[PDB]
Amino acid sequence: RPPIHTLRQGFDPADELRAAGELTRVRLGAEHTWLATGHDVVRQVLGDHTRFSTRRRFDRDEIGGKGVFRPRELVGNLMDYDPPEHTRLRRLLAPGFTHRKIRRMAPYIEQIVTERLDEMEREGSPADLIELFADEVPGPVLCELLGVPRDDRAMFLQLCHRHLDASLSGRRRAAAGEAFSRYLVTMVARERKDPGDGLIGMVVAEHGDTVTDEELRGVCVQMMLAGDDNISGMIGLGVLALLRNPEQIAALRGDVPAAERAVDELIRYLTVPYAPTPRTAIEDSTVGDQVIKAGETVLCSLPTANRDPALLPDADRLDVTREAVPHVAFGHGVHHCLGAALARLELRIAYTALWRRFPDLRLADPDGATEFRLSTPAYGISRLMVTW
Ligand code: HEM
């Protein structure tokens, strides 16, 4: 019943997913799409921002293009944007995501990670690493990214949690949306009067009169949606991967270059997103061996692409010591993950700190079943009991 691109077995793409061709037509459930699994063909699809569109459309209706109405729920979602509109928004947001600016967040990330590790120690072992650490680190970090006032963060995160809660429907969902929107209206008004030092403040100081309040409010929701599940998934899965490959933990207790090498290897090997935004062909183009017809959709399996032998040899193995390779876990092209550096940093800090606090960290029950996080937009672990 579940679609083929969502299928996993342990840390790996499922055999069924691995058996599919480089580029074939599949049926979801009922929709019909192209599934691209090869590294080459995924890069060809993702590097093409002029013959493919990512803008969600309704009824089938103009495919790509400029100045089409966009529903509230998608304003400020860069992934739903085509150039030239994508190009505008990305350029406005880019200056907040450099290596230099993201490097400045290091002390705060260390603080957040330390506060969470403290909770674990206070709770005592055995402890659930997911609930106390993995699910708890990303929110505050994204707050800092945005420049949500330090003292507003607890209420901000709860309002946000309810709004992005897929389990809610009807009035409870609508009210969660209304409430969060109430805070973000206040936040944008605060920023319009005295621009802060995070992302929202940066944008109003430089481009104030040309950017809208809706856009700034949308940017806030969409950053939270883009940067939470992926990080919590990586922390959970990455810890399990390292614990089950204990010899490779030593790469997180050496110098920074080696811990950076371990992080990007874990990102490739675990590949938490199942797929980037579906692409719709605007005009006919050849991808790999096949003609993809206008109006047809393409879905890229990022995990399989990151197991392609053309990317690296011994690709189904975890090896933290190796040089970084041009994997597609963050995607490729103009939509290439805007938070890439932040993700890399966040994760490096969290892994390093965890083993610094708990050198002899172990699985509470290594012979028990693993509760994987299923039916979400990002693979992960929902519960992971640990001792120290
Ligand atoms: C390891 C964790 C992460 C992974 C694996 C990941 C992966 C990806 C991928 C594959 C895309 C491409 C989507 C597409 O082309 O359709 C993307 C886009 C994006 N990511 Fe991430 N991401 C991660 C963490 C983050 C974080 C921490 C942020 C910060 C908020 C973030 C913000 C974004 C944004 C804003 C985009 C849209 C960029 C655009 O469309 O131009 N991501 N990410």
DSSP helix/strand/coil, 388? coil
* Range of the structural domain that residue 387 is part of: 1-388
Point out the ligand 1 atom lying closest to the alpha carbon of residue 277.
Answer: 16
Point out the ligand 1 atom lying closest to the alpha carbon of residue 332.
Answer: 15
Q: Is 43 in the pocket of ligand 1 (CB under 6 A)?
A: no
Burial class (CB in 10 A: 0-12, 13-18, 19+), 124: exposed
What spacing in Å lies between the alpha carbon of 93 and ligand 1's midpoint?
13
- Is 55 annotated as a binding-site member? no
CB of 236 closer than 8 Å to CB of 296: no
CA distance 202 to 324: 32
Q: Is 339 in the pocket of ligand 1 (CB under 6 A)?
A: yes
- Local structure of residue 27 (DSSP, 8 states): E
What spacing in Å lies between the alpha carbon of 53 and ligand 1's midpoint?
17
CA distance 348 to 355: 11
**Residue 234 identity (one-letter amino acid):** M
Nearest to residue 113, comparing CAs of 86, 92, 144? 144
DSSP helix/strand/coil, 286? strand
Helix (H) or strand (E) holding 104, with range, is: helix 99-104
- Local structure of residue 117 (DSSP, 8 states): H
Point out the ligand 1 atom lying closest to the alpha carbon of residue 81.
Answer: 40
* Residue 353's CATH number: 1.10.630.10
DSSP helix/strand/coil, 168? coil
- Is 337 annotated as a binding-site member? yes
CB atoms within 10 A of CB 79: 17
- Is 344 annotated as a binding-site member? no
Point out the ligand 1 atom lying closest to the alpha carbon of residue 142.
Answer: 30
Tokens at 3, concatenated:
């679609």
CB of 106 closer than 8 Å to CB of 349: yes
DSSP helix/strand/coil, 258? helix
Q: What is the dihedral of CA 351, 354, 357, 362, to 10 degrees?
A: -120
CA distance 171 to 326: 45
CA distance 329 to 340: 10
**Long-range contacts of range 9-13, CB-CB < 8 Å, 24 or more positions apart?**
11/237, 11/241, 11/269, 11/270, 11/318, 12/303, 12/307, 12/316, 13/301, 13/303, 13/304, 13/307
Q: Is 303 in the pocket of ligand 1 (CB under 6 A)?
A: no
Burial class (CB in 10 A: 0-12, 13-18, 19+), 49: middle
Q: Is 272 in the pocket of ligand 1 (CB under 6 A)?
A: yes
Q: Which among 225, 330, 337, 342 is the best mutation to test ligand 1's pocket, defined by most ligand atoms within 8 Å of the CB?
A: 337
CB of 23 closer than 8 Å to CB of 35: yes
Q: Is 345 in the pocket of ligand 1 (CB under 6 A)?
A: no
Q: Is 337 in the pocket of ligand 1 (CB under 6 A)?
A: yes
3-state helix, strand, coil in the chain (%, to 5): 50, 10, 35
Method: X-ray
List the Cα angle 83/87/88 in 5-degree steps: 120
CA distance 262 to 253: 11
- Dump the DSSP string for 118-141: HHHHHH-SSEEHIIIIITTSHHHH
CB of 37 closer than 8 Å to CB of 21: yes
CA distance 338 to 358: 32
Q: Is 331 in the pocket of ligand 1 (CB under 6 A)?
A: yes
Task: Classify the C-alpha dihedral 309-311-317-322 as positive or negative.
Answer: positive
CB of 339 closer than 8 Å to CB of 97: yes
Q: What is the dihedral of CA 246, 355, 142, 42, to 10 degrees?
A: -20
- Is 6 annotated as a binding-site member? no
Residue with tokens 């599934």: 35
Nearest to residue 245, comparing CAs of 269, 229, 271? 269
CA distance 334 to 353: 33
Identify any residues that bridge with 388 across adjacent strands, giving them in sequence order: none
List the Cα angle 6/136/301 in 5-degree steps: 20
C-alpha distances (whole Å) from 307 to each of 25, 322, 327, 343, 353 are 20, 15, 9, 21, 29
Burial class (CB in 10 A: 0-12, 13-18, 19+), 169: exposed
Nearest to residue 41, comparing CAs of 381, 360, 332? 332
Q: Is 227 in the pocket of ligand 1 (CB under 6 A)?
A: yes
C-alpha distances (whole Å) from 25 to each of 37, 262, 308, 350, 353 are 12, 36, 19, 40, 45
- Is 207 annotated as a binding-site member? no
Q: Is 77 in the pocket of ligand 1 (CB under 6 A)?
A: no
Task: Classify the C-alpha dihedral 175-176-177-182 as positive or negative.
Answer: positive
| 113: Cβ contacts below 8 Å, ≥ 6 apart | 137, 349, 350, 353
Residue with tokens 């901000």: 156
Tally of domains within the chain: 1
- For residue 226, how many C-alpha atoms fall within 13 Å in the half-sphere facing its CB? 27
CB atoms within 10 A of CB 146: 22
CB of 113 closer than 8 Å to CB of 353: yes
Letter string b/e over residues 361-377, b meaning 16 or more CB atoms within 10 A of that residue's CB = bebeeeeeebebbeeee
Length of the chain: 388
Nearest to residue 352, comparing CAs of 282, 260, 275? 260
Output the residue whose Cα is nearest ligand 1's atom 43: 337
Answer left, alpha or beta for residue 295, where phi above 0 means left and psi between -120 and 50 means alpha: left
CA distance 115 to 237: 21
Tokens at 278, concatenated:
């579906």
Q: φ and ψ at 371, to 5 degrees?
A: -85, 95
Nearest to residue 53, comparing CAs of 377, 360, 334, 349? 334
Q: Is 338 in the pocket of ligand 1 (CB under 6 A)?
A: yes
